[PDB]
Design a protein around this ligand. Structure first.
Ligand code: NI
Length: 341
């Protein structure tokens, strides 16, 4: 059954709750972003209102074939009324089109649901600064102190210099980037840009990217593999066997592959810096795992919550075990005592 942490009290609203059939009493289904665990269950046959960003609406329409009449896109940073309740969508700094949702209840309670986010100090100067939030439904993916990672900007710097150097030393080297959802487009676009190439990908992925309102996107991507030296592949195909295989397909246009696997966290984050990363090399094929996160680090999460000073925190990730739940509740209490709310 639909868990309590997907229901918004005092409304008939649910968030990211599409895989439970009809939810008894739900008059409006919100979708924070187009990632499969969150949209799981949506299809062309859904006949309830879906509220979401414009970008997520383009993807529902063109990728899922949900009918236009059930998609209600809302602009960001705008007070809107939905079934008699004031709501605001804010940028989540996650993947394209991803949002947080502010709900202003008739009783006067204010609730923020973060969806998936990477907390940033820029959020402290959004519409959130304007009033008190009583309840926070929080993305707790990395709610533990071991979870450190560098800034997105540092990680992109690294990838750009690595690729530029490899290709300038060997003009017959191919760059491959792995992907399995939207998110992390900066990795492959920043690389394409330093190398004066468009990025090349399958027809399905090209269609996916054309939904995302990226400015000048026609100048940056293509379906013509042959004309491009940055290729996107399924993340599943990013391994020695999958790359060798792929190398054959280019017909001796390239003799070397430099590939990037943009991971989340991996335990080498607890030891090594970005400057000191190394690849796995089997011959003329090298694979970098880069820790490009679109979720809050433990410290970024801690700062956001200490700034927000919520009265109650409801976790939306890692809720399935008593040990995780108990651990998260300990960190929340530490934060609250340190900050005095
Ligand atoms: Ni996500």
């Amino acid at each position: 059954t639909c868990p309590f942490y997907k229901k918004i009290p005092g409304t008939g609203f649910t968030v990211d709750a599409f895989q439970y059939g009809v939810v008894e009493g739900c008059t409006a289904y919100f979708l924070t972003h187009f990632h499969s665990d969150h949209y799981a269950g949506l299809s062309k046959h859904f006949t309830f209102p879906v509220y979401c960003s414009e970008i997520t609406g383009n993807l529902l329409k063109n990728k899922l074939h949900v009918q236009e009449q059930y998609i209600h896109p809302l602009p960001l940073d705008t007070e809107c009324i939905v079934n008699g309740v004031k709501v605001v969508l804010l940028d989540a700094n996650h993947c394209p089109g991803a949002v947080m949702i502010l709900f202003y209840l008739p009783n006067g309670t204010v609730i923020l649901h973060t969806g998936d986010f990477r907390a940033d100090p820029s959020m402290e100067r959004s519409l959130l600064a304007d009033q008190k939030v009583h309840m926070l439904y929080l993305d707790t993916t990395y709610c533990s102190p071991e979870y450190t990672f560098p800034s997105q900007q540092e990680v992109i710097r690294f990838a750009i210099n690595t690729a530029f150097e490899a290709v300038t030393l060997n003009p017959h080297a191919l760059v491959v980037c792995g992907t399995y959802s939207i998110g992390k487009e900066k990795v492959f676009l920043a690389i394409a840009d330093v190398l004066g190439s468009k990025v090349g990908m399958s027809q399905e992925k090209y269609k996916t990217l054309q939904c995302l309102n990226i400015p000048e996107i026609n100048s940056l991507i293509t379906t013509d593999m042959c004309s491009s030296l940055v290729h996107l592949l399924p993340m599943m195909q990013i391994n020695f066997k999958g790359l060798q295989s792929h190398l054959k397909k280019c017909g001796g246009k390239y003799n070397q592959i430099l590939a990037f696997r943009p991971t989340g966290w991996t335990h080498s984050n607890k030891f090594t810096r970005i400057a000191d990363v190394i690849p796995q090399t089997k011959g003329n094929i090298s694979i970098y795992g880069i820790p490009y996160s679109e979720h809050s680090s433990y410290l970024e999460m801690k700062r956001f919550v200490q700034w927000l000073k919520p009265q109650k925190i409801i976790p939306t990730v890692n809720v399935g075990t008593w040990k995780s739940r108990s651990t998260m509740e300990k960190y929340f209490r530490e934060w609250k005592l340190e900050a005095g709310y």
